[PDB]
Amino acid sequence: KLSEEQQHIIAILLDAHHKTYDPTYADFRDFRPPVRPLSMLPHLADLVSYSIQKVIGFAKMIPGFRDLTSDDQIVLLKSSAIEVIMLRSNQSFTMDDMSWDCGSQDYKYDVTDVSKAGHTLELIEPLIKFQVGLKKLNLHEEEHVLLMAICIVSPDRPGVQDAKLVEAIQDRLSNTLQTYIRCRHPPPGSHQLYAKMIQKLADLRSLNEEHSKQYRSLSFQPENSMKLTPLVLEVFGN
Amino acid sequence: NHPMLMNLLK
Numbered sequence A: 001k002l003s004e005e006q007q008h009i010i011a012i013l014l015d016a017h018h019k020t021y022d023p024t025y026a027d028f029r030d031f032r033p034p035v036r037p038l039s040m041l042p043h044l045a046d047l048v049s050y051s052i053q054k055v056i057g058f059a060k061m062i063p064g065f066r067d068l069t070s071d072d073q074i075v076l077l078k079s080s081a082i083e084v085i086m087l088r089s090n091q092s093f094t095m096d097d098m099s100w101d102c103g104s105q106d107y108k109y110d111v112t113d114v115s116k117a118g119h120t121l122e123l124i125e126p127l128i129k130f131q132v133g134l135k136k137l138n139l140h141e142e143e144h145v146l147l148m149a150i151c152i153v154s155p156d157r158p159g160v161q162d163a164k165l166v167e168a169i170q171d172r173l174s175n176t177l178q179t180y181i182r183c184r185h186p187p188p189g190s191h192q193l194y195a196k197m198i199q200k201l202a203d204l205r206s207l208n209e210e211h212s213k214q215y216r217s218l219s220f221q222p223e224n225s226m227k228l229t230p231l232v233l234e235v236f237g238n
Numbered sequence B: 001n002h003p004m005l006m007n008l009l010k
């Protein structure tokens, strides 16, 4: 059932993820150092700005993405950026202590670190529950990278102009994912896996909404906006 | 409007 075109799409998305996700976390030394109010805001703002650039690199390699206009590519990335970053960070999240382990003690982030960047339990509690539930899915890397692409290319993002073209690109990705689960994911892990994965996308939309709320309250203080980066201000708002 | 996003997209 898995056509050669569908196998082609998976190979590209796997390669795109490997070219944009460094599992050594080497570049983290270039950030402003972490201090453990809002002592973690400089470091974590540098982390998000770094990851936005990686999300852009990944999106450019999604089949069909560069058939969209630059206006549509911009609005899809603006809307999905924080969702894809939260989804990507599942690779560093660990159940042993409910933290994001990125190679060393300096770059291990727990719930208190996120709150030392200006965010509250309104976001942190659903965020942790998202990371746990995603880990319980035990996704193949093939499914992990397909979910990242489906999240970016969604027709209902605000500001989309050629939703019909966005929908066509997403449908080709969704059919690849559904057929992949069918032929390559054995039961019982296969059980309603596609529906469970789309529920995680719905979880990410809610997390996106709460983050935007807390970001605007954060960046409304000029002393806080001083600590952000120019790319973060362009993407998330000034 | 979004010059840095456009540069990374090119």
Ligand SMILES: [O]C(=O)[C]OC1=[C][C]=C(C2345B678B9%10%11B6%12%13B96%14B%109%15B%1172B932B437B%1285B%1363C%14%1527C2=[C][C]=C(C([O])(C(F)(F)F)C(F)(F)F)[C]=[C]2)[C]=[C]1
Pocket (backbone or CB within 6 Å): A041, A044, A045, A047, A048, A049, A051, A085, A086, A088, A089, A090, A091, A092, A093, A100, A102, A109, A114, A117, A118, A119, A215, A218, A228, A232, A236
């Ligand atoms: O992916 C990998 O495995 C390794 O790399 C990464 C990349 C990102 C994360 C994270 B994870 B917790 B979830 B929150 B904190 B960590 B950092 B983002 B992900 B969200 C995250 C975060 C911080 C800052 C803001 C912020 O709102 C603030 F103002 F700085 F607080 C802004 F940056 F967006 F502005 C928003 C979200 C972990 C590992």
